[PDB]
Every structure is written in structure tokens, then in C-alpha cells.
Design a protein around this nucleic acid. Sequence first.
DNA 1: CATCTG
DNA 2: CAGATG
Length: 327
Amino acid sequence: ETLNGGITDMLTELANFEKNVSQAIHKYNAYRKAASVIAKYPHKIKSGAEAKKLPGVGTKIAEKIDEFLATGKLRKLEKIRQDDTSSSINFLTRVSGIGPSAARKFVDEGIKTLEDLRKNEDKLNHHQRIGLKYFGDFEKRIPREEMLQMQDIVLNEVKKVDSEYIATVCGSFRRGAESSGDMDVLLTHPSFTSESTKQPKLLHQVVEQLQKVHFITDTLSKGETKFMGVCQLPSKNDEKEYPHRRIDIRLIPKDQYYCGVLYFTGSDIFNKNMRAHALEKGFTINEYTIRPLGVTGVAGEPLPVDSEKDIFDYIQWKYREPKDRSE
DNA sequence: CATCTG
DNA sequence: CAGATG
Ligand code: NA
Ligand code: NA
């Protein structure tokens, strides 16, 4: 956790690069286990060979740890951190919409900067365009003081279109967090579930309302159960308009809300622990359900949940207010 | 994983 | 349809 930190970091830099710049998914994946393992390793890695000793740890990495241990740096790391091409690729990727794949193409075409991109808005697709449009806004965190206002709007409008809708804002916003990255809404209706054959309108109706009043301003992607957009809190009395924020809305069958709700609320660590304990108590959990574990190895069957409570209960545990869902 | 693009 | 992005 700090004993082998640099090593784990340098490896992460390397891993990252394999995958992003080169296309070395193999290698990329290589650095990953490696860091994962040295990550757990209880002692102070004093050398290559010592490391090699571990699994995932081959000769080449060993080589690497050596240099880095021997001198405060790595040539390869040093060489990559310069290389304009590599840098471009890490940068373009910042744009919502450009993945690495794209980043390569553009660079090989000479697009390497923000301006580059504007000049060539023709080559970017819609998502990518919105992305470029709101680069800044997009990178800005979201303060809860704003989140609360957003939440206020969305919930009220869903209310109006249908009294029967159930919306919940998950994320860290939910776990207490002072600021967040994007707004994430979980949505269900009574009339939609596991079996119920669809109802797209269930989602599209709400999306519209939200644009009806202008809360939503753009659509990144809109399907029948998941919507990816851009919203914005009405600029008050002109002088201070707000940054544009990423937002998602997704339809969930009422019969799998809470697990999803639970699940999205996180944090990752909370999940895991809860997941393992579930396992203990003779259970299973994933994003949509909790099932009684058979002894034959495993087994299924959907346990029936009416709130985050039914879940906890199930695995017989202390109901956890979202704030204390941390670890 | 669900959506888009081409 | 494969293959990209979030
Ligand atoms: Na991106
Ligand atoms: Na293939």
C-alpha cells in the first residue's frame, strides 16, 4: 500500500501505455497482474530477483524493477513521457467520445490538439462533438450544492409525468460525497419488470419532460433502457450560467431495482465485502438479484426484495445508511 | 452491457 | 455485422 508503491505505479504507467499507444493488450494485461501481485506483497521489494519470485513476474519486469530500484527512474518511462505521439493519445482520449482507437487515427492524421479537433469537426461523430463542445464543463467536478438542485428537478418532473415512477440518484451523491463527476439516475416503474414485455415509453417519456423544461440539453446516446445525455441547471438571473453536466438515466424492472440501487450506490469496496458476507450467509448477489446458494456447488432462484433492507436482512446484517457504505 | 457507427 | 465507447 506504500511499501511497493513506486513499483506498482511505474508498472501501471507501463501497462497503460501498452494498451493506449501500442496495441499490446497482452503486455498491457501483463503489467496489470504484476502490479496487482506486488501490490499485495507484504514486504519491501529490495530487488528484481526477489520480485521475479512472484507469479506474473517474469524476467522483463524483473529487469525493469531493477533499474527503477537501482536509479530513481526508468528510461522507457522517461522516453514515453516525452514522445509527443504518446502524449497526444493520452490527451485526445480526454474527450468524451474519443477512445484510444480513435485517438490513434486522429493522430496519425495530424490531429493532436483541441484546436486540431475544432478545425476538423467534420471527422468527429455526434458524441464526439458534444464531447469537444463541453470539454471544460465535462472535466469539472459537480458540487453537491448543485447536485441537490439537479436532483430536485429531475425528481419533480418524473413525478409529474407519472406518480408511479421511482427515481433514485445513486453514486457517491448517495453515499454522502461533497462533489461528484456525473448525475446517475436509476429508474423503475411498477408496470415494468423481469417478464413484462417491455415498455420503452417508460423511459422516453421522462427524457422528453426533462428536455421539455430544458434540463436536458443534448443526447449522447438514447436507447430503450439507457439514456446518456447532457443537462444543465437553468442559469438564474443572467451573470452566472452553469457548466454542462453529464447525466444518465436507466430503466430497471421494478423486480430488480434495489439490488441495482444497492449496487450502483457502492462503493466498490462496500460491495465486495457485502458480496463476500452474502456468500457466507449462504447467498449470492450481483447487480440485479440475490439468490439462495445451493450446496451442490451453486444454485439459483430470485430472492424477493422490496427495499435495500430486504437485501441486508437476507444476509442478516446491519442496515447501512448510505453514508457508511464507504468500506 | 447497451448503444452507435459505418 | 464487428468493433468502439462509456
Ligand atoms: Na474518451
Ligand atoms: Na476478431
